[PDB]
Amino acid sequence: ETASGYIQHHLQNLTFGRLPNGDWGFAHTAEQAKEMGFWAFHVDTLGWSVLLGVVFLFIFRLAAKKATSGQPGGLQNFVEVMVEFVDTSVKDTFHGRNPLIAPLALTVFVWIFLLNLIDLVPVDYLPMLAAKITGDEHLFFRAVATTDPNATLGLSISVFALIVFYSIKVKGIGGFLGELTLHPFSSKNIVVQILLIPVNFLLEFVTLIAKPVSLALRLFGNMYAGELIFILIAVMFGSGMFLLSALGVALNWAWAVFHILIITLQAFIFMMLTIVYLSMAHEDNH
C-alpha cells in the first residue's frame, strides 16, 4: 500500500445512509459516501461523542449524588475545583440571574476537553482495533470527533439558537428588531432614520452570522491541522529507515507537547466565547 492511499483511508469516516436499494447499510467507498445525500450519519463521531458525554455525566453524578458538604474526597474535590473555576469564570462576565449559563459552560468545556483528549492516542491504535474486532480490512473509523466539521457546526448552531432564544426572551421582537435595524445609528428625523437602516442591518446581521461560523471553524481547523500533522508523522515512520524514525519520534514528542496545550487552550477559548456571547444577549452594548 502507498502513503497516499493510507492518508485517504485515514481521512474517510464511517457513513450510514440511504443506499440505492434500501435505507439500511454502510458505505464501503468514498464515492459511495459522496453519493449519500444530506440524510446521512457519521456513526463513529456520534458514538464517540455520546460515549464521552455519558462518561463525563456519570463521573460528575458520582461526586454529586453523595455530596458530603464537609471534608471532600478525591473525586469530589476535583469536581468542586472545576465547578468553582466555572463559577468564577461566569461571574466575571455575566451579572444576571440566569441559572443556565454556568452548567452549560461547564458541560461545553468538559465535553470539548474530553473530545480533544482522544486525539493524543496513536493514530493507528483505535482504527486497527475496530477493524480486527469487526473483521474487515477496509473499515473506516475516525476516533477524533472534533476533526469532523459536523460536530463543531452543530455545537455552533445550538449556541446561536440559544443566543437568539435568550435575546428574544429578554427583549421581545420589539427590542430584537430595534437592535437589528435601529442600532447603533439612530436619528430623530424620520427620513434620516429610515435611510440609516441598511448599514445597521448589514453590520448586525454580518456579525451575528459570523459569530457561530468562527466559533466552529477555529476548533475545526485547529484539530484538523493537528490530526493531519499526526497522520503525516505516521507516514514518517512508514519509510522504515533507521535515521529517519528517530527524527520522527522527536517530532512526535514536540507535537504532542504542543498539542496538549493547544487542546486545553481551544476548550478554554470556546467556553469563554460561549459565555461572552450569552452575556451579550441580555444587555445592550450600543
Binding site: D92, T93, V206, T207, A210, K211, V213, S214, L217, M272, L273, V276, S279, M280, N285
Partner: protein
C-alpha cells in the same frame, strides 16, 4: 475546465491567506493593547476582557465570510457550471 479549476484553487488560496494575515495582525495588536491595559489596571482585567471579546466580533466577520466562500468554492463550484 482545467483552467477554471486551476484559477479557483488560487482564488481559494488568496481568500484564506489574506484573511488569515489580516486576522493575525489585528488579533496581535488587540492582544498587545489588552495586555498593556491589564498591566495599567490590574483590577479592570475582567471587564476589559469582555470588551475585546466584543471587538473580535467586528474584527473577523469579513474574514469568516471569506473563509466560508473559500470552502464553498473548494467543495462546490458555481463557476464550472458557467462552462
Amino acid at each position: 475546465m482545467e483552467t477554471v479549476v486551476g484559477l479557483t484553487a488560487i482564488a481559494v488560496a488568496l481568500l484564506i491567506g489574506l484573511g488569515a494575515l489580516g486576522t493575525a495582525i489585528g488579533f496581535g495588536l488587540l492582544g498587545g493593547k489588552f495586555l498593556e491595559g491589564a498591566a495599567r489596571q490590574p483590577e479592570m482585567v475582567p471587564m476589559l476582557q469582555v470588551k475585546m471579546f466584543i471587538v473580535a466580533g467586528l474584527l473577523d466577520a469579513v474574514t469568516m465570510i471569506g473563509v466560508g466562500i473559500a470552502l464553498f468554492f473548494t467543495f462546490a463550484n458555481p463557476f464550472v457550471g458557467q462552462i
